[PDB]
């Protein structure tokens, strides 16, 4: 709910004691309590000002170790005070597994834990040390309730793996396979549970981003910009303008439920090869999806503007969108229907009345 990771308990102070934090090489959260020092280790960079000593008075101290991925904060609240362990904890990790920790020391008391993947308040046996790691296997069942970020992250790393070396794969994937995967990917992006307003999956040759739309989003247009560093791959940057009508709930729609924006940015056309295998500028294929919605006959069009290096001696640039035939099981094709092109030498803009 409110944080990615919460580990709480009580500490019996039998003497003047210290707080110690280290950045671990391993992606674990390690908590080790000795009589003189409470030690916390996490994969995040150490904040440079971490206080050395705990409050002088002896007694029982309630504590909670907090991690939040989008706030980038790993802080330890302790008794009446709060200690900031890391200020740059913005890294995709999923804590759902406790490892056996056989360290000796002063056991912690009334310990409990809850994470994003395991949101229940789970009491743990008291122990001098605790180790929190992740499962590698996908333990989330086929509930369709929510998709796990780290599971989706590995799936998108798998696709990126194929885009880098599509010649190396064991098979040339059929159209039905690719269509099934792109449906699955879209489905998982609309249902993935995360804490921030935006979640981006940035991989080699693919970048998928999820926007949690506000109720206010229907009121105003949406502007999106990207950065690609101007290498000589023929495409350098893009911008998007999404009209307010695209985000508007339908006339007979109810409940004002949250909707999501999906921008899947491909730097590869491996999944979009028509018959005759037509080429696309910079292999750029840009997927735009409003969750479970099709809009058509737009007054103000969605516009896609692309900066590129010109190669116009024997070629013209035409804005198109990928269309497939359900019940064909055959490769798709490009269509320019309802999409107007303005193609200056170094810049081209696509004006489409639908997405």
């Amino acid at each position: 709910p409110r944080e990615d990771f919460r580990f709480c308990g009580q500490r019996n102070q039998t003497q003047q004691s210290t707080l110690h934090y280290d950045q671990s090489s391993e992606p674990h959260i390690f908590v080790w309590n000795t009589e003189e020092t409470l030690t916390i280790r996490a994969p995040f960079l150490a904040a440079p000002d971490i206080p050395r000593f705990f409050p002088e008075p002896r007694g029982l101290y309630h504590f909670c170790l907090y991690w939040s991925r989008h706030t980038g904060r790993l802080h330890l609240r302790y008794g009446k005070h709060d200690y900031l362990l890391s200020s740059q904890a913005s890294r995709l990790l999923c804590f759902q597994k406790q490892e056996q920790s056989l360290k000796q020391g002063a056991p912690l008391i009334a310990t409990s834990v809850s994470s994003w993947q395991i949101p229940q308040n789970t009491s743990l046996p008291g122990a001098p040390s605790f180790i929190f790691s992740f499962h590698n296997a996908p333990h989330k069942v086929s509930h369709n309730a929510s998709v796990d970020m780290c599971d989706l992250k590995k799936e998108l790393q798998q696709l990126s793996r194929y885009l880098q070396h599509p010649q190396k794969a064991a098979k040339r994937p059929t159209a039905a396979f690719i269509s099934q995967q792109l449906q699955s990917l879209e489905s998982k992006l609309t249902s993935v549970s995360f804490l921030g307003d935006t979640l981006s999956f940035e991989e080699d040759r693919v970048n998928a981003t999820v926007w949690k739309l506000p109720p206010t989003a229907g009121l105003e247009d949406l502007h999106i910009h990207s950065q690609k560093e101007e290498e000589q791959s023929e495409v350098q940057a893009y911008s998007l303008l999404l009209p307010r009508a695209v985000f508007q709930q339908t006339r007979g729609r109810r409940r004002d439920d949250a909707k999501r924006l999906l921008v899947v940015d491909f730097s590869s056309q491996a999944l979009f090869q028509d018959k005759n295998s037509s080429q696309v500028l910079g292999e750029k294929v840009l997927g735009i999806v409003v969750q479970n919605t099709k809009v058509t006959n737009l007054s103000d069009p969605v516009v896609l503007t692309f900066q590129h290096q010109p190669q116009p001696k024997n070629v013209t640039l035409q804005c198109v969108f990928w269309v497939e035939d359900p019940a064909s099981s055959s490769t798709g094709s490009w269509s320019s229907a309802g999409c107007e092109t303005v193609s200056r030498d170094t810049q081209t803009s696509c004006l489409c009345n639908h997405l």
């Binding site: 899947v264 491909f266 056309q269 979009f272 037509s278 080429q279 696309v280 500028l281 750029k284 294929v285 840009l286 997927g287 735009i288 999806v289 896609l304 692309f306 024997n314 070629v315 013209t316 640039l317 035409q318 804005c319 198109v320 969108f321 990928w322 490009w334 320019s336 999409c339 092109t341 081209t348 696509c350 489409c352 639908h354 997405l355």
Partner: peptide, 9 residues
């Protein structure tokens, strides 16, 4: 919907 800019000769 996946938008792209076709290269037509």
């Amino acid at each position: 919907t996946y938008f792209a800019v076709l290269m037509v000769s």
